[PDB]
Amino acid sequence: MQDAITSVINAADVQGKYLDANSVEKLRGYFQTGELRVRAAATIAANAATIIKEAVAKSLLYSDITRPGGNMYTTRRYAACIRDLDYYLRYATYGMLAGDPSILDERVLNGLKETYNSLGVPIGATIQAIQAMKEVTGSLVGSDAGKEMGLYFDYICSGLS
Amino acid sequence: SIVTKSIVNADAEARYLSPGELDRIKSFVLSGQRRLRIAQTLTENRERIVKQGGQQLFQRRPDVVSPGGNAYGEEMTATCLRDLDYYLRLVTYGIIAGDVTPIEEIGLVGVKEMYSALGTPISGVAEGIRCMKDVACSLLSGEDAAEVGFYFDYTLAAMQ
Amino acid sequence: RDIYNEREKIAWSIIIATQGLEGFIDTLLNTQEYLSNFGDSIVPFQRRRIIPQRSKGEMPFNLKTPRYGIEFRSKLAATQFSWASPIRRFRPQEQQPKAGDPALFLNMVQEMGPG
């Protein structure tokens, strides 16, 4: 994984360069938003279970997928999918704190579509549940942190589609 | 299933089924007929069992249907009765299989996680299952009721 | 007026604890500071909140001190999503349509009238 600072340092180091004015620009940009990022991460850690509960209730709780024949019918499957949503929320929070989606590429999206296709998990319903989670999360953390979190939520949805 | 479980437990050790396991499979296939009869009786009396269990639950746990309770309202009460019907069906499956593998693989693994994510008190589900157990054992003979409650007790233990 | 320093709150915290609320604000209203400014006949107010030529002020005392602070927030502040069993939705997707949904044009067919 590499955060914004690591990415800037890598871009400068891969050219044998010292950190010039543009690197300082990006570094100041990250340092100004770090405190908002910490606030949002704390608030999201506070209310993870309620966020997942509300997203599931608004997205797929009463649809036909929770009915016999659906992919998430039995109790095993319901528990597995809520665990998946918890994974997505936690990794989106990591990406928001780091300011860089490389952790999502390395730890989440690598081989996820193939696993879901082998298992038979519907991708569209998953993307819609992540979109509903984006709504609740932006709601709870306010506009700026919600846009920051929605960046990585949309990153996960694009990597999954 | 008893046959399946015997086969896996013999498969891990890389041996054929010993004469004890074959004896037990034989005894199972010999009792399959009364197993099907008991499953018949429990299966086709499902409406009374679910209804009377729901009553005993709601009288023992008025909070779940009190104003705001998890099963508060027409739809939530219907959903709770739906869950009780689910578990009665699983008990019939387990009765015909001769072992709690069907009940445990469907409806017991991860049940605490699901009911915690839904906001439902698991003790209320245990109470409903106990009430359904009494109602269902009331309709069986002595030995049949003993063998049938054998599975309700396991479902209650797993749902603590 | 504002408290002079935190030692003054330590000073006046003790009359409540011994002589009740009734003896605390008994001693408070019989000070020379109260009778000097308001007497018996004037509703009290914040004295010299604004400096005259300036626009900005010094945070009026209802905003300065609400009912409870940080000490009590940890104990009786509220929360979001408190397992609280809401009134349900049953069809969240039908409420607003998607992009290619023809549900956006149902408020248009009346407009096209064969007459």
Partner: peptide, 22 residues
């Protein structure tokens, strides 16, 4: 494969298609 086993064949469900009027 077990008891609670998913099959596309036996999936009568609008989870793979998002028909939200059903």
């Amino acid at each position: 494969s077990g008891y609670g086993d998913y099959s596309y064949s036996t999936d009568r469900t609008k989870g793979h298609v998002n028909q939200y009027y059903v």
